[PDB]
Design a protein around this ligand. Structure first.
Ligand SMILES: [Ca+2]
Length: 245
């Protein structure tokens, strides 16, 4: 089912946010944070690429919102909660479950759980994510979360996901990662990716990909991406963290 905005739909992109699950857990641990049930339960699996989980799908700054004075950073920080508009209740990471239940169908909830360990349960990551990046757009939750799942799978199945899989636990260079990405989607789209790392030596924690708003309901190709200015804080070499602290 197609993902369509009903309000503030005049934005040009979506940032698919994927996290290297193992790395994510590794960081929460090293920062001395409380271990979540998703990390405490985290365990080794057959397809290493499956460690690439869904974090979210974030629409870019809507022109109609920018027109009212909202800037890129404010948008990145508050999303649907920016003022003067859309001005919806702020979604807080410290109380994700306090955000409104999305209305996601049981079927889509199950598909999401398989790839978004933080969804539902006592985390409620999907409520936080929808309140911040979807509610103000009137997105059908099913089409919204259903699209994240699809995109995550296509990524995992491309040379990008395979790259991660083959270098599981190894140190890689941003250069080769870029070649892996460019291999499936073109050299010119390498700048659509922002990588996030933690620690020193740096290890991967998240992958952010800029996708054209107009190409969101189609299988990814070399015309689905938009370059963006932030390479990330990973440096030219980083580690594809393995499961376990
Ligand atoms: Ca680890």
């Amino acid at each position: 089912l197609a993902l369509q905005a009903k309000q503030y739909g005049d934005f040009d992109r979506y940032v698919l946010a994927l996290s290297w699950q193992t790395g994510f857990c590794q960081s929460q641990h090293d920062r001395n944070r409380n271990e979540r049930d998703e990390c405490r339960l985290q365990t080794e699996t057959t397809n290493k690429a499956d460690f690439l989980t869904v974090h979210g799908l974030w629409p870019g700054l809507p022109k109609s919102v920018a027109a009212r004075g909202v800037d890129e950073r404010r948008w990145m920080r508050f999303g649907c909660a920016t003022r003067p508009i859309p001005n919806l209740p702020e979604a807080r990471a410290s109380r994700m479950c306090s955000s409104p239940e999305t209305g996601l169908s049981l079927e889509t909830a199950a598909k999401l759980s398989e790839v978004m360990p933080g969804a539902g349960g006592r985390s409620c990551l999907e409520r936080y994510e929808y309140a911040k990046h979807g509610a103000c757009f009137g997105f059908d939750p099913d089409a919204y979360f259903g699209t994240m799942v699809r995109l995550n799978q296509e990524i995992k199945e491309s040379e990008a996901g395979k790259f991660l899989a083959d270098n599981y636990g190894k140190t890689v260079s941003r250069r080769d990662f870029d070649a892996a990405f460019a291999k499936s989607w073109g050299k010119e789209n390498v700048k659509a990716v922002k990588l996030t790392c933690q620690g020193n030596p740096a290890y991967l924690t998240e992958i952010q990909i800029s996708i054209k708003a107009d190409a969101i309901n189609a299988p990814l190709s070399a015309n689905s991406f938009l370059p963006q200015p932030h390479p990330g804080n990973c440096g030219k070499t980083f580690v594809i963290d393995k499961a376990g602290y």
